[model samples]
Target: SMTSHSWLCDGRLLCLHDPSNKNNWKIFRECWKQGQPVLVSGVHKKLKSELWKPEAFSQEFGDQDVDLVNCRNCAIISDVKVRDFWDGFEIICKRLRSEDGQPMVLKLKDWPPGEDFRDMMPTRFEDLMENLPLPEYTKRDGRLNLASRLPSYFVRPDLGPKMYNAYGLITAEDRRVGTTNLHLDVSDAVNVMVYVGIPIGEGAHDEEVLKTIDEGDADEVTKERIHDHKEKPGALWHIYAAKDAEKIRELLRKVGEEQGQENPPDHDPIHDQSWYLDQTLRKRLYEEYGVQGWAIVQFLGDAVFIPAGAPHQVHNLYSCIKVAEDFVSPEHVKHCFRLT
Candidate 1:
């Protein structure tokens, strides 16, 4: 009774439009059966909350609902004052590209009759493009535009494959919602960035965490705003696309050379070994990155896109989560991996 939103498996957000009408639900349901992404044009907070004020956990409003002012964006961002350079700069974006070489598709709905919410996330449109191979698709990078390429297939459901279905694909990039690739390459969802880190307190793991808690700089309000506050101080803040990447890479390589002289080629380079991102590693990326809203884009063509670091094992028709840690992190991996 308190929550106001109801979800149709088809990806439409609906509410009572005419209180005096004798049959609004019937009229709305009839339209939905024809397959339309219908939503109220305007809504009040009370009506909006009814659809998604979770009784226990969190709930999400459809991007369409959010666009219509039905939902207010959360200020879940970061605190720079309490932040250190190693913790990676934080960015809170309302929308972003789903992956490299893909058009941005953050404002799509679910597909099929009941596509999951996560599936509505976007991806590189080229990943699923029909009648195109990787080479040609790659060339279209940063140049593809849906306004010109997509036909009535996106709007008129009865004309062909159905707009809702196409929209769903645009949202999930795949068939499933809440999808994830759990890798570092590409883009999707939110960002859980760890720029760089070195031990600032006691050397031991337990002691390091304790020291991090003691030297708090952010206020409670600020902390709550962070998307990934659970990250501890001593932990390496993984970084992405840093401006100083060349310097960091050079330093890591030199360190690797020194270590190579003392040990086998397999021996960890002091710098690169500590701070690294994996294009192939999946699970750990999800836990560390996705947990804070990251996802990897596996596909992006048409108007669809996914979030940055979702579990993508499903995209390949396989399950990647097995070991307690992601395959790339290596269960035996040393804590030496850092962005700094």
Candidate 2:
């Protein structure tokens, strides 16, 4: 009998690193269909070196009008501390001026053509974009171009190709205590985020901590401390997927009802915004559904992929810089269409 290996069995997460890998799309399409979280190492390197640095982002758009920057409660802002969008922007601007300050966060949901700020993107970003080409099958007639897959819409007449896509995101925050609350993105596109900064906790490794506990070297108190330290804030990504659209829609409806909104939704759904689940609800959702999630300690020089509609959040153990882009994939178009 031949031995078989399962990627999911090895770990809830699947990662790949191959600069010249031809199976990139194949692997992505497969994992995506299974609703599995995947990370492609080194994809962040495609951007210009400067684009990855918070300082570069600050220099490029920090002083620009706050109106130009679209702020999300958790997408680019602290979920708890910052109450209002403008307030969050002011706080980040204050940090940008200080030597050692809070994270300078800014996100633009769409970067339509002819926009002045859209031109602020680094030239290097364009160069690195060729790294992940869309699957060949999606481009049979070459009808869909890269820009068409991006988040921008209404640049011309009629609805654009992409739904729930974004031009890009730029975030900078102190490693001291940066984190995002659990939430789902309101889109039908996969997310690509590149990290640029020193590793969180410098050289801290979770495996070493686990080894100490397993070896039985630590006493009860020490073991407790170790576990607490392990749980301490750090750079990490947690992702969850729903088995069906009904589950997601129900969750959204419940959230709306909890917030006292109507069925037609007088306002935007919380999922459509950078909103986090209340702790009580977050726990209840996972336990009730037996939904499994993957947690990743985000590392420098890595590109993280978040499938469309996956509920996820991050905790930043140290100061870091991240640039993100969202795209609609042909394989996942139906999911996006139905969700939207």
Candidate 3:
């Protein structure tokens, strides 16, 4: 998609990671210094339209194919219609009660993949950025955000905004299946939580679902539970300093070695994307290496600012929809040049 002569990836606008521009929010810059993730809260009230909710997607794109991934094996479970994926979501939970074997835990990632989110759907994308307004200080012309400023033809995968939707830990047995493995992004980004909701027994008519919550009184009790959980966080994030990428690798290497995992020449401990650093690993990290990471509980309407090349991972705590826009920072554009 290159035009005639728009190859100016390196402009004078690329100078420093100075987030001190008056337009930039204070917390954004404060966290940017330590390379920690910051949560900008309370913006959910600003959102306009029911279009961004979990149910809305099923209502809108039900017939469309959705790629479902099993978080345990990190493999695509199957490709099903968006309708079955969302509507059947409660069904998956109910099945776990009696089967007593392994459980069904699923996540639908990158619903509309392979293109900029700005181009997807009706005006939903526009409405997202419009209300979230996404800090113009982070825009390319603002002499801050490089992803928007860079020539699209050169940046691999065209680092615009990307959306990742997922399910929470379905039941207590649903461990390890609703988490995003630890990984690194080569670009600085902001992940915005668009929807955070829990559906206990919304579809009662289904005979399968009815079996789990029997009789009349049970439905009312479960509905109360739903309201209780709606206030819960959407996801948990662990972000490490970009400079400490090696310390994280050191920890991963130690664990993998104990498990007899051979460190292949082509294998990248972090970028290969295998580890999810639960509470145990997190405790071991701080105790063993004296390295601490940001443990962020992201609520609805919160935007998490992840710096370039910082090691990070997310674990879903509730079924949610989130949109992330990547930007190349002035500081990282330099990190891109000579070395890191």
Candidate 4:
């Protein structure tokens, strides 16, 4: 299952199962992003051999980005788009006072285990939001801040804002197939399935269906199938909220146990308790402040922002956990001042 191909940039398939390594496998070919055409230099012919190159394999080409064409014979990868890939984006991760601890505000200066790490990004709602129907936009007379309000239809009096934002990671694994689906969304709700890239030409990869599904939104048959899929095991990390800290901690414990690590364990940067901490914080901001979606911080894993009402489920051996909280100010106290 190992591959050897060329990264059009360097014309070489570097490594086996290690896309970043340059020595894994070396061959003459090219690398192209999904949806982009495979441009060749001269009259070079594509050797449609069954043998795979290292660079291609390392990109999860055959292992994670499963393709039906090459299920047994063909070598063509379907044109799937990579939406939130870490090619260009800004992700900032820091820990600050999330809640009042003892008599003083007990803040987290360092990123905690299994916590949301995308809270540090530049969120549009953080500064652009004004004259909404929320209590924060209220006047001294208990009346609405009518001057800067958006239309009533788009602004709900009870719903706070149309979107709440946070950042974390949602890992959909089908151990049955050994495939993982990861996505970053800036939506509201937990039950919704946001858009994400599917790796094609990778073995055992599943096709992801993007679009939110409310109760009764889909036909009975589709709903039934989705319900059955939920029964399977999987893991999701959401924005962090202080009120949900206890629940998130419990979920983290479950995640650790599932991973066969200790409850509330250390992280591997790519997978660990710190993973939970980074995700929980973003959800916290979204719940109370109506933060609109999450920005991803791709260090070892992707961080997913849990908008209010966005429903998500998984089918694998993982647990779901995130922390969320209400805001005391228009902006998160942590972001009020620069903490570089």
The 0-to-1 C-alpha lDDT of every candidate, in the order given, reads 0.23, 0.42, 0.60, 0.24
Clashing pairs in 3: 147-328
Q: Write the per-residue lDDT of candidate 1 for residues 77-152, one digit (tens) a residue.
A: 2222111111111111212223353322221222212323224322212122221211111122213112223333
Q: What alpha-carbon RMSD in Å does predicted model 1 have with respect to the real structure? A: 23.0
Ranking by TM-score: 3, 2, 4, 1
TM-score list, all predictions: 0.20, 0.55, 0.76, 0.21
- Candidate 2 lDDT for residue 247: 54
- The ten-residue window of minimal lDDT in model 2 covers 160-169
Per-residue error (Å), model 4, residue 143? 19
For lDDT, candidate 1 versus 3, the one ahead is 3
Q: Write the per-residue lDDT of candidate 3 for residues 1-340, one digit (tens) a residue.
A: 5221110112101111222234445434544655655555555666674877666777877888767776656667566787766764544454222144654456776778767466657477666555442364344344566655555343432534577776665443343332787888777777778887655653322232222222111224323322565544567666788888888888888899889988864457887787877666877888999887665566677677777778887777666788876666665664444333
Name the regions of candidate 2 deviating beyond 4 angstroms: 1-10, 44-47, 67-118, 133-193, 196-235, 242-282, 338-340
Better of 2 and 4 by lDDT: 2
Task: Write one digit per residue (lDDT tens) for candidate 2, span 91-208.
Answer: 3333222134434444323332233323455353454445543323222123432325434431211222221111112222122121454555433332344432322312343454
Better of 1 and 3 by TM-score: 3
